[PDB]
């Protein structure tokens, strides 16, 4: 069984614009970072390929896909598309990430699935664009690779597919996509919509509809979440899923936004708890298909996914970053949101110290209601 990382430095040329949180390098940064740390070899890397039109149409509608292609190459917001497809605003702007970069991340998810089906283990850090809808952009996402991937598996004959989303934001796009079926089960832990995007979905009472009622489980969590609370919630929710669903295969999305250093979440987790969460899922369901996700702090993203790569790859995690790696991170013009918190300590070690605490009653209550 080989372990593979799907990626390419080309993502670096399809960055979001200016002000946008996705302006920073991410998968290209991960690749350069693992290379600088000498934690990856050429034969472990599979070059990302674009999703084909056919693969895209496994989930998205033609008119929507055609609009993304036209908007991108002509660099415009076609008449009626802002309203109809949610394209053009600050959130889902016109850029080359809208179709080319998105198609590359999505093809990489199909590649990750292809590798898994060959019996190998793969990680597509560019994947996990979980907010896009069948025919509309949303939450910085234009193409929903998790949904394309799940439909890819359904076409292959899988009838029990589990999707687990550990990103700090709700996979509203994925929820809608499989809300109606009992063939797919979606579990998402995320900041409560009472205070975080998408605000409109992500509540605990959304458990599906029709045949799929009972096959969607949202675990909304509070501000200031610590490591113990996140892992408590994870272990308990996995038990709920396990008692009701026996997956033939599962996909796991690993956005790094739940970390303390990422301002896009009110969660204050450590990279080490992030790593334990990943391993807890594997202990419960064995090996699955691994995807990236939201993560908007370059240092946080790089070190955390590096822990994931080291776990999968079977190599020891160095306790410190070498010079090439620190200089790489320092070269990223990022600018911390808070004028000065000082995140330079992140350059001094790969793993951060645990960030635990007591498990609040709120969290215990949510999981108890989720069970019933």
Q: Give the tokens for residue 330.
A: 């320092």
Q: Domain span at residue 180?
A: 1-372
Burial of 313 (0-12, 13-18, 19+ CB in 10 A): middle
Contact 225, 267 (CB under 8 A): yes
Query: 322 φ, ψ to 5°?
Result: -85, 180
Give the CA count within 13 Å in the CB-facing half-sphere of 190: 34
Number of structural domains (the chain) is 1
In angstroms, the CA 297 to CA 337 distance is 10
- Other Cβ atoms less than 10 A from the Cβ of 352: the count is 22
Strand duo 121-124 + 161-165: pairing: unpaired
Q: What is the largest CA-CA distance in the chain?
A: 56
60, 130, 131, 170: the catalytic one is 170
Which candidate, 116, 354, 342, places its Cα nearest to that of 251? 116
What resolution does the deposited structure have, in angstroms? 1.8
What's 356's DSSP letter? -
In angstroms, the CA 10 to CA 25 distance is 10
Question: Which residues are annotated binding-site positions?
Answer: 167, 169, 257
Query: 133 φ, ψ to 5°?
Result: -100, 165
* Residues composing the chain: 372
Which candidate, 271, 240, 243, places its Cα nearest to that of 258? 271
225: left (phi over 0), alpha (psi -120 to 50) or beta: beta
Q: What is the sign, positive or negative, of the torsion defined by CA atoms of 66, 91, 278, 30? A: positive
Question: Which residues are annotated binding-site positions for Zn(2+)?
Answer: 167, 169, 257
H helices of the chain, where?
27-36, 53-56, 62-74, 81-85, 102-117, 145-155, 172-178, 227-244, 271-285, 298-313, 323-331, 361-371
Give the CA count within 13 Å in the CB-facing half-sphere of 14: 18
Contact 170, 218 (CB under 8 A): yes
Stretch (H or E) spanning 121: strand 121-124
Spell out the residues 6+ positions from residue 60 whose beta carbon is closer than 8 angstroms to its own: 132, 134, 135, 143, 144, 148
DSSP string across 207-257: ---GGGTTSEEEEEE-TT--HHHHHHHHHHHHHHHHHH---SEEEEE--ST
Measured CA angle at 54 (ends 53, 56), to 5 deg = 65
CATH of the domain at 322: 3.40.800.20
Annotated catalytic residue 20: no
Give the CA count within 13 Å in the CB-facing half-sphere of 293: 30
Contact 147, 166 (CB under 8 A): no
CA-derived radius of gyration, the chain: 19
Spell out the residues 6+ positions from residue 66 whose beta carbon is closer than 8 angstroms to its own: none
Q: Give the tokens for residue 250.
A: 């599962």
Helix, strand, coil abundance in the chain, percent, nearest 5? 45, 10, 45
Query: 303 φ, ψ to 5°?
Result: -70, -40
Spell out the residues 6+ positions from residue 299 whose beta carbon is closer than 8 angstroms to its own: 261, 329, 334, 343, 346, 347
153: left (phi over 0), alpha (psi -120 to 50) or beta: alpha
* Experimental technique for the deposited model: X-ray
């Amino acid at each position: 069984k080989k372990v593979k990382l799907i990626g390419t430095l080309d993502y670096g040329k399809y960055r979001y614009p200016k002000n946008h949180p996705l302006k920073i390098p991410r998968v290209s940064l991960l690749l350069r970072f693992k290379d600088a740390m000498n934690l990856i070899d050429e034969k472990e890397l599979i070059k990302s390929r674009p999703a084909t039109k056919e693969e895209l149409l496994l989930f998205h509608t033609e008119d929507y896909i055609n609009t993304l292609m036209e908007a991108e190459r002509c660099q415009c917001v076609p008449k009626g598309a802002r309203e109809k497809y949610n394209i053009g605003g600050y959130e889902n702007p016109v850029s080359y990430a809208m179709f080319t970069g998105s198609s590359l991340a999505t093809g990489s998810t199909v590649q990750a699935i292809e590798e898994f089906l060959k019996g190998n283990v793969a990680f597509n850090p560019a994947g996990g664009m979980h907010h896009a809808f069948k025919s509309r952009a949303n939450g910085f996402c234009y193409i929903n690779n998790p949904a394309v991937g799940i439909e890819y598996l359904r076409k292959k004959g899988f009838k029990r597919i589990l999707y687990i989303d550990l990103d700090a934001h709700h996979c509203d796009g994925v929820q809608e996509a499989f809300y109606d079926t009992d063939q797919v089960f979606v579990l998402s832990l995320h900041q409560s919509p009472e205070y975080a995007f998408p605000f409109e979905k992500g509540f605990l009472e959304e458990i599906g509809e029709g045949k799929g009622k009972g096959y969607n489980l949202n675990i909304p969590l509070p501000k200031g979440l610590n490591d113990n609370e996140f892992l408590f919630a994870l272990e308990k929710s996995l038990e709920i899923v396990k008692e009701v669903f026996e997956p033939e295969v599962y996909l796991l999305q690993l956005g790094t936004d739940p970390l303390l250093e990422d301002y896009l979440s009110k969660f204050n987790l450590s990279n080490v708890a992030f790593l334990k969460a990943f391993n807890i899922v594997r202990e419960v369901f064995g090996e699955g298909v691994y995807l990236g996700g939201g993560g908007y702090h370059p240092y946080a993203l790089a070190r955390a996914w590096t822990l994931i790569w080291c776990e999968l790859s079977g190599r020891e995690v160095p306790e410190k970053l070498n010079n090439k790696a620190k200089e790489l991170l320092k070269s990223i013009d990022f600018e911390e949101f808070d004028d000065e918190v000082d995140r330079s300590y992140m350059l001094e070690t790969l793993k951060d110290p645990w960030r635990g605490g007591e498990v609040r009653k709120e969290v215990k209550d949510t999981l108890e209601k989720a069970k019933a």
